[PDB]
């Protein structure tokens, strides 16, 4: 009888819900701001 912890956690997280494109593009903005502070 094999452990089920790894598969069960994945099975429970399964969801078509995805990160919003705008949310992805927004996190990009803070990072680009940190990059600009470094001259890049």
């Amino acid at each position: 009888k094999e452990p089920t912890d790894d598969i069960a956690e994945a099975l429970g997280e399964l969801s078509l819900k995805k990160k919003k494109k705008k949310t992805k593009d927004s996190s990009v903005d803070a990072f680009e701001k940190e990059l600009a502070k470094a001259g890049l």
Partner: protein, 204 residues
Amino acid sequence: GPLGSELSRQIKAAASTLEDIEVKDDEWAVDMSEEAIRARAKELEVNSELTQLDEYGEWILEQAGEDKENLPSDVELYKKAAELDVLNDPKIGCVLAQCLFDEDIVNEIAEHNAFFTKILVTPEYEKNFMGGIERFLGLEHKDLIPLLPKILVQLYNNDIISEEEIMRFGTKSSKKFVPKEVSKKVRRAAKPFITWLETAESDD
């Protein structure tokens, strides 16, 4: 004996070819033959880009150590990539996938979203990253293969890797990153997630 004259000769020649390679490799530093000098010169031109990727991986490992909680900041990871001129190399994803994570990969893979969007410029970068994950789990840490379904959920939900590249990793045999037997094992460990995705895409 059972081999026969021809196969015995073939086996003996193979052994001698292999023994000669071992001598040439073991005595390289005292080898001043025209062959060795020319070879050392060629290795520098042919492996220039590889040396730059190696230096990035070495720095990542040296800065973080065994624990990936000491990893340099995403800004620092990007700055070093630019300094070594590896940003324009799709294999940077292969380096990152093999050097940024440890046993806490499920949590770690989702802690660099903006960095991955900026670094993984084309689907080719995403493919190289997936190849690196294939090597990390299939060759270097076979004990973590059970985490692949969870790893894939983090990649899909955070939009780190495209559905198309996740599907190629899970359904296609690429001999570029891992041996065919290793590929088969990784795709099997991924099948639980891939089946869900194929059905979700079929449902549209």
